[PDB]
Amino acid sequence: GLTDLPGVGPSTAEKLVEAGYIDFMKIATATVGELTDIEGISEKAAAKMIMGARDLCDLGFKSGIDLLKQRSTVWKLSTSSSELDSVLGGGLESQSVTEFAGVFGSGKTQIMHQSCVNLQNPEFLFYDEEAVSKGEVAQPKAVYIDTEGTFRPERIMQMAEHAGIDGQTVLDNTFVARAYNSDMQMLFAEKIEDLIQEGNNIKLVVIDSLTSTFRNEYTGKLAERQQKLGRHMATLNKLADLFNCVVLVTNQVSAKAEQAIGGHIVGHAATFRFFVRKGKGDKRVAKLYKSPHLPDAEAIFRITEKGIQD
Amino acid sequence: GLTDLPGVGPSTAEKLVEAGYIDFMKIATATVGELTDIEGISEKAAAKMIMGARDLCDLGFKSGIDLLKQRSTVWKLSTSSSELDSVLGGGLESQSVTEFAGVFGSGKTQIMHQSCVNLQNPEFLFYDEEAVSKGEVAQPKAVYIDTEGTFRPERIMQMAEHAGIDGQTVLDNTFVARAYNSDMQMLFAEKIEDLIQEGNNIKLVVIDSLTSTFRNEYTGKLAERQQKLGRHMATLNKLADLFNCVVLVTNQVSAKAEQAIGGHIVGHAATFRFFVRKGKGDKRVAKLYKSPHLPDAEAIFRITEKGIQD
Amino acid sequence: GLTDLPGVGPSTAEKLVEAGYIDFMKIATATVGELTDIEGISEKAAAKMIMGARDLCDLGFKSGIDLLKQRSTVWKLSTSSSELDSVLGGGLESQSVTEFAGVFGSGKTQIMHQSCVNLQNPEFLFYDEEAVSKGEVAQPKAVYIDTEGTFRPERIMQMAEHAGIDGQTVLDNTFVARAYNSDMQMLFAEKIEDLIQEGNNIKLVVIDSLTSTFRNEYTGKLAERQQKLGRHMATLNKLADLFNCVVLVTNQVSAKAEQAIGGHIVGHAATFRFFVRKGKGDKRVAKLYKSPHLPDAEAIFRITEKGIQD
Amino acid sequence: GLTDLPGVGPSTAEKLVEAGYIDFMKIATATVGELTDIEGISEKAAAKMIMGARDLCDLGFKSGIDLLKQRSTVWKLSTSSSELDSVLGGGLESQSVTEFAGVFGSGKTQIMHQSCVNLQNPEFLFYDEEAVSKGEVAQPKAVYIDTEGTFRPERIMQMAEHAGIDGQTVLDNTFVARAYNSDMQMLFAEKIEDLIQEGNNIKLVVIDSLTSTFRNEYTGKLAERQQKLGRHMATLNKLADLFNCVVLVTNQVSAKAEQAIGGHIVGHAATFRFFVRKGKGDKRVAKLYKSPHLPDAEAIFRITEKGIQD
Amino acid sequence: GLTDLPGVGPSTAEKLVEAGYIDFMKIATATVGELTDIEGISEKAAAKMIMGARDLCDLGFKSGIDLLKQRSTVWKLSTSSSELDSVLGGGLESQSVTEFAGVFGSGKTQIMHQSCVNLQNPEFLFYDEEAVSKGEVAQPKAVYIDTEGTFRPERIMQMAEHAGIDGQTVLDNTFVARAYNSDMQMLFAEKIEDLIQEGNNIKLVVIDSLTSTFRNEYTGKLAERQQKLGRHMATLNKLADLFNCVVLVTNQVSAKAEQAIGGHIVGHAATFRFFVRKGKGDKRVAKLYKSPHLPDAEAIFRITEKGIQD
Amino acid sequence: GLTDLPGVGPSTAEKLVEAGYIDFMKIATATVGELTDIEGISEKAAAKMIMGARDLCDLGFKSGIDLLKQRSTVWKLSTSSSELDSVLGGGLESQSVTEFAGVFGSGKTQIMHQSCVNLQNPEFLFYDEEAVSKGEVAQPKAVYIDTEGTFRPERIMQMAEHAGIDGQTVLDNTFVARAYNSDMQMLFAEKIEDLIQEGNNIKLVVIDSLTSTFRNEYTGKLAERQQKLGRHMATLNKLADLFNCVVLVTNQVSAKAEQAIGGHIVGHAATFRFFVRKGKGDKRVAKLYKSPHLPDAEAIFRITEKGIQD
Numbered sequence A, B, C, D, E, F: 001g002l003t004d005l006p007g008v009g010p011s012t013a014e015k016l017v018e019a020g021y022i023d024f025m026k027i028a029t030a031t032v033g034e035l036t037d038i039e040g041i042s043e044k045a046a047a048k049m050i051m052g053a054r055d056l057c058d059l060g061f062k063s064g065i066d067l068l069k070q071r072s073t074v075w076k077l078s079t080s081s082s083e084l085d086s087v088l089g090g091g092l093e094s095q096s097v098t099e100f101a102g103v104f105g106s107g108k109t110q111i112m113h114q115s116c117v118n119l120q121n122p123e124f125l126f127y128d129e130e131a132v133s134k135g136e137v138a139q140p141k142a143v144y145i146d147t148e149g150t151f152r153p154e155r156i157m158q159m160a161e162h163a164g165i166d167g168q169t170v171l172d173n174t175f176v177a178r179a180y181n182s183d184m185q186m187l188f189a190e191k192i193e194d195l196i197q198e199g200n201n202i203k204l205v206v207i208d209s210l211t212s213t214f215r216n217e218y219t220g221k222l223a224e225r226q227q228k229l230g231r232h233m234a235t236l237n238k239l240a241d242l243f244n245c246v247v248l249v250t251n252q253v254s255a256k257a258e259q260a261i262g263g264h265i266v267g268h269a270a271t272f273r274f275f276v277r278k279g280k281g282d283k284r285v286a287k288l289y290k291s292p293h294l295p296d297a298e299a300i301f302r303i304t305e306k307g308i309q310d
């Protein structure tokens, strides 16, 4: 527990738990100011527990085989499409933010729904059991921050039915928050940590859409928009890392051919970026154009009554 | 009333009512700047009542069966065509924007007129009584923003007569605003909230046409056009959501085969999108090509002296 | 006068009159940029007089019986054919653009000439005296923009003689502008407002032909053609509305059986559309295939030495 | 001269003369792009001289008696047949295109030859001396674009002899260009303006045949054919108007009873259209079936060693 | 040679010669597409050499005495009948297509044979030596496209013997191609240009019969027949013009009294048309019913063991 | 050893080694306060050993050929791109900080990985053996401070394989420290000196990214940000100098076209600065826009499965 930390006694631990610092990584990655803002915690005590948490979490230089072990803590979520899983190097990655931008109706929201369904199929989580334990991915839950009102429980049921999963179980293990503007959107994202503290193993976070709120609220003001968006994406990236979570976001496009909106801050902050377009009928094509370790490539798949397939 | 909100006393409530914030949802979805622009309301007070309104409206994370309850607040309006109602998954949806684009004379304006008539037939509103009360849909009124001058009261009378409804009652419960340009069009849409505040249960909003004004006003300038159009569609989407209203818009087409005009912003902002074309004689075919939860499909119907039928 | 408007004093009124804004409707339907382009008029002043003009002209939401009153301001011009007047729902409508397309020699130009003659017969203007005053239709004048050189004063004289009207009076009350290309055609149409300002009660505007200039000037470039054509038709529609004028246009046809030329922009912009074809001898058949409120139908008539008859 | 025009100085005038714009009407009817394609002429300067030329040529709205004056600038050429001149309302009209279609051997080419002969008989040009001056029709010359090789100087001599005219004078005042295909045909027509610039008072232009080249070159491709034909007929119509010239064209026929070939574009572009058929022996019958101001009618005449007679 | 042409160097000349363009007139009358279809020749280069060839061949406007010089390049072939030569205005004309239609056994094929024999008698070619040189008509050769199998060398020998000519010389200077269907017939005609390129001075081309193949191959399909026939006759007319050749064709007749078969396209394309019928015994009567410059007239002649005589 | 220094005996040397001052240069460049902060070391003793270390290290005025010898101690690391090595004047320079800024996905992180691989290929270190000994660059190790989580051992393996190097050897000789915020980032950089003291020949230091942590932590506070950033870059520059190390940093960009973020302090502190942008496909372009001795220039290269190439 928190009292394992230097300078931290039962009293200080109570103050930390109340201020939301319940595990070591959050303390190890905190700033002294951040902790001193907690009544009762001094600069000296704050600096001492941060150093102790870094030490207990072994956050130092690593080399050799240890570098491979860190990469092995990443687990991946299947998309239900073999070509898409392949272009992704296996599946959607935990500890990163993956963005699907695309023209209207291309399937961005369908992919988000399919992901909430797939999270409830144990065989769709791919991981190295020696680096990620069965308990770490047990009873996974998803958080869907819907900023457009397009969450559709009947779609969840249909995709689950076709996947052989129970639809009600997916709805029971998915938290949906409807955000009507960028302030709500950002706050819900900041509150995911509270869901985790309440015992929910959040392993998938969806922000659909990442930018439609900001784009119609900040139309001159393009700096304050970029600033707020940057804070939001830092929160997303940090939660993906600290909670070994897959974070997926959708994005719209504008002319100039098309470019995902959101400018440089969204461009730098999204770890993986895709452009999704429609093919003939129910065919879709997802083009990976940014990733840390894979070549750009395209995946053809379909969206049908069953969800994503092929 | 508004004084149920934290920090809000009779004085502040008067200022809110005067500034147009009369119900909790509008306050819960406001920005601090938006409220502080009201003389007498501070940043602190503004932030406090927004949080209180969100709390009173229970705008947090939901899961399980509660996800189904939200979807059940959606009611649908019949189109008078059984095939069209079926392709729509039941009828035109409240809380969303539905767009009918199509070549000249295909029936876009006829569908808008039929919808104003159908709103006055209680049996044509389909809803789950446990989620939507009889009082919520009682004395419904329509708003028709006519940007081309094609509203025709004699057509309203004819369609009503054939539906067994009283024509004068439809005209009495339909507000029509003739907009000669995009500025008027946008302002009328922004003023619908005032009609509601005056006691009119606005449940159907029609924008016919959504784009003919913008397309001939902005011919280079294609960015300022897209910006204004985006603000207008955000206003439409928000009013559909906050007032549990069906919002219908018509759109024109251009070569490239045909594509509805308005580009990406109209494409992303319209929840449902149809392409209407003429068949032989009075036959028409409506092709649904964008929707959140339904497969693309086509509906055949007819437009006759009776209105839409089949 | 213009000083009735908020913010407008004698000085500003002079600037408005000089820039061509002489009546309230034109100001009520102007854009702030449009007015600020007048040296001396600020954005603030511009926005204030537009709002004041809208208010003085009562351009807001209307419902009930008021919806019927707006429709009653429409007056109709007889075509001299009882079957054609019937298919038209009474006659050619003011505040709309009516297009007659047809194969060569079918009578498009004859109908335009007959209309200029009929305008000078008081009994051929059909209107509701409680909505349209005798003074509003008094001393009516026609404008004929001839883009092919087919205006024929001797035909005017012959048709007038057979109608019992004085031929010279028709020529005296008809302004003809010969346009040799689309630029001239468009400019003449834009200058009709100046004729009105000079005291001419323009109540009929004829564009014969609407498209023959554009079709041979833009032969690739089919986008710039559609753009120019759209601006021209917006000017026509707006003048029909603001000046309670009947606007008639003729159009040619091409193979594919036949289709009027001009594509989607002419198709959407023409309120009423007819296809005229020749029958045996002097018999003609006009097929109405687009209108806001009438079923498609055909009218048989004849073109003789007397003009249009039957 | 050209420097009378606003913005045009000696330098610009030289550039205009070199680019072929030598008189005001051609400039008044030019497009800004058309003039800016002249090295040295800017968009601003181009727009300014076009407006100035329109102003100097008084190309605005006209009404009353002025409408009669425009029609009086039309002069007519006798056909040598009293019945044909009568069906034509006086003779072949300047400022228009007149088409004679007919079965083989019906006399199309004979009429073209007779017209070149008649142009050289002063009494065969009918005009209102107060609208058309003796100098305007003095030293008239004809241009005969022969696309079949049927021009026959011996026929010219024979018809001239029988008319009391000198045959050599007709040949001296007739330019013949043999076109072997539609490209040559169109280019010769475009070059008539150069003949005029060289001091030739071209008052009659004959295209015999208008369509035999296009019909065997474009046999699928029926759109490109119609496009080229349309450009050619626009050139013909514009030269008839700008140079107060009679333009005559011949056309072939096909089964379906017979119809002149060339489709809708030739049908709309020819101002007057005749069908010529053979009667018994040297008798011929010309049926007028399209004209702006005359009833359809038939003229009987004969073709003999003397040319057209009766 | 071809390098005299602008843009044409030795390389391009080789490509032209290989593609069959060996003399200037063929290039002057080519289309840009036609030349660009030659690998190595660009649109720009093609347009430039066509203009250069037209210029080198002086294909512009001509007037006065020059019009007589063009007509003087026409030479005529005697028919052996003085009355027939007289009705023809001298003899069969080069640069034109002359058709002899007639009932069975009337002598159509005999006239074709006599013409091949007469071509080998220098005194039977009538020409103006100042316009046509002795070298132009030297070593003339004939091409006989026999579509019925009726070419008879023994008839050639007999007619030659009676004319005082050597029979073998006529056979040596006559190329006969037996066509079993319209495709072969048309191709042989298209290949005459190759014979000329090989050094044969082709001055007479006979198509016997022009229509018997088409009439039994296309029996509904009367449009495709007319199209193919038109292409074939354009090829014939162009070769008559470019190679200053006499082209003769025979045609059959049907009831309706009789009419030559082939419809309007053969009727327009044949420059001269005759109807041949039998008189008593070996007497024949040829009625000229279409020609550019001669009155209709009849010639009586006989067909005997000597060939055509009288 | 340290006792070679004036005033320093075994006891004082122990205190120095414990406080991290193990070699003369660090002492020669220390402040008296810095050393007196070591219990047991007086101001007098501190001043005396600093002067002695400066003397033993010969840190005085130099001129003539000695100026060239100092510059010769700089060694350079190949980038694997010949154009990039050329724009760099040979390769990445030791004793300096080189910054690669660029839009998302441009290859900043790929260049950092390639550099860690290239360090393990002896032939990729370019140096003057008379100024830099084989032992000075022997067993080189890299330190990669990853502030975004984008270090990818599989990429190291792939690039090493394609370079002919052993992948495991690169991972064994590369220390990676994951920093979640600017405090960790700065501390890891300060701790590199300890790695060196432990016997690791650190010759490459990578900070990827230099600014993404600071930019989202300090959003007003732009002074404290600039101060912390300045201290961090001084630490980087000093370690590059004292340990003859190549220091590479990556940077993000913002609109204003683009500018690397970090303001004036990063701009002054980075010795070399590049802007990297994407070309077509895998092509990249690196623009050098700041350096001490080279002209601005651009290098084109590619990023493929092999790493950086061209």
Ligand SMILES: Nc1ncnc2c1ncn2[C@@H]1O[C@H](COP(=O)(O)OP(=O)(O)NP(=O)(O)O)[C@@H](O)[C@H]1O
Pocket: A102, A103, A104, A105, A106, A107, A108, A109, A110, A111, A155, A158, A303, A304, A305, A306, B267, B268, B269, B289, B290, B291, B292, B293, B294, B295, B296
């Ligand atoms: N139940 C279903 N059966 C078959 N196809 C479906 C179903 N539901 C949705 N679709 C398909 O999914 C498309 C809509 O996909 P969606 O993921 O919502 O697009 P989107 O990219 O998020 N568009 P938006 O947010 O406006 O930009 C539809 O138009 C249908 O083609």
Ligand SMILES: Nc1ncnc2c1ncn2[C@@H]1O[C@H](COP(=O)(O)OP(=O)(O)NP(=O)(O)O)[C@@H](O)[C@H]1O
Pocket: B102, B103, B104, B105, B106, B107, B108, B109, B110, B111, B155, B158, B303, B304, B305, B306, C267, C268, C269, C289, C290, C291, C292, C293, C294, C295, C296
């Ligand atoms: N009273 C009626 N009786 C029968 N059919 C009618 C009636 N009124 C309208 N229609 C039909 O409706 C068509 C016009 O439909 P409309 O809805 O106005 O087309 P639209 O798509 O809105 N065209 P537009 O806005 O120009 O693009 C007519 O041309 C008639 O076919």
Ligand SMILES: Nc1ncnc2c1ncn2[C@@H]1O[C@H](COP(=O)(O)OP(=O)(O)NP(=O)(O)O)[C@@H](O)[C@H]1O
Pocket: C102, C103, C104, C105, C106, C107, C108, C109, C110, C111, C155, C158, C303, C304, C305, C306, D267, D268, D269, D289, D290, D291, D292, D293, D294, D295, D296
């Ligand atoms: N004075 C007249 N007396 C009787 N009929 C007339 C008279 N004038 C014109 N017509 C008829 O009107 C026809 C021409 O009608 P018109 O209106 O000019 O056709 P149009 O459709 O405009 N053709 P165009 O513009 O080429 O496509 C003639 O060919 C005559 O049949």
Ligand SMILES: Nc1ncnc2c1ncn2[C@@H]1O[C@H](COP(=O)(O)OP(=O)(O)NP(=O)(O)O)[C@@H](O)[C@H]1O
Pocket: D102, D103, D104, D105, D106, D107, D108, D109, D110, D111, D155, D158, D303, D304, D305, D306, E267, E268, E269, E289, E290, E291, E292, E293, E294, E295, E296
């Ligand atoms: N010198 C003449 N004397 C008497 N009649 C003549 C003379 N020249 C020509 N004709 C008549 O004119 C007819 C030919 O007329 P022509 O004008 O060439 O017909 P066309 O319609 O142009 N035929 P085409 O172009 O094939 O379709 C002849 O067949 C003679 O009937």
Ligand SMILES: Nc1ncnc2c1ncn2[C@@H]1O[C@H](COP(=O)(O)OP(=O)(O)NP(=O)(O)O)[C@@H](O)[C@H]1O
Pocket: E102, E103, E104, E105, E106, E107, E108, E109, E110, E111, E155, E158, E303, E304, E305, E306
């Ligand atoms: N050697 C000959 N001596 C005398 N008369 C001959 C001789 N050869 C042919 N004829 C005459 O020529 C007639 C046949 O002429 P011919 O030119 O073949 O007719 P055609 O019009 O071409 N018939 P066809 O092609 O069936 O329609 C015979 O029937 C004989 O009258």
Ligand SMILES: Nc1ncnc2c1ncn2[C@@H]1O[C@H](COP(=O)(O)OP(=O)(O)NP(=O)(O)O)[C@@H](O)[C@H]1O
Pocket: A267, A268, A269, A289, A290, A291, A292, A293, A294, A295, A296, F102, F103, F104, F105, F106, F107, F108, F109, F110, F111, F155, F158, F303, F304, F305, F306
């Ligand atoms: N294994 C690989 N094979 C081929 N190309 C690759 C591979 N790995 C990465 N890439 C390319 O490298 C790009 C990513 O380069 P990267 O160096 O991470 O960009 P970056 O500038 O650091 N972006 P960021 O930090 O967000 O601003 C990819 O999107 C691929 O184009």
Ligand SMILES: [Mg+2]
Pocket: B148, B149, C095, C096, C097, C237, C240, C241
């Ligand atoms: Mg209108």
Ligand SMILES: [Mg+2]
Pocket: D148, D149, E095, E096, E097, E237, E240, E241
């Ligand atoms: Mg010829």
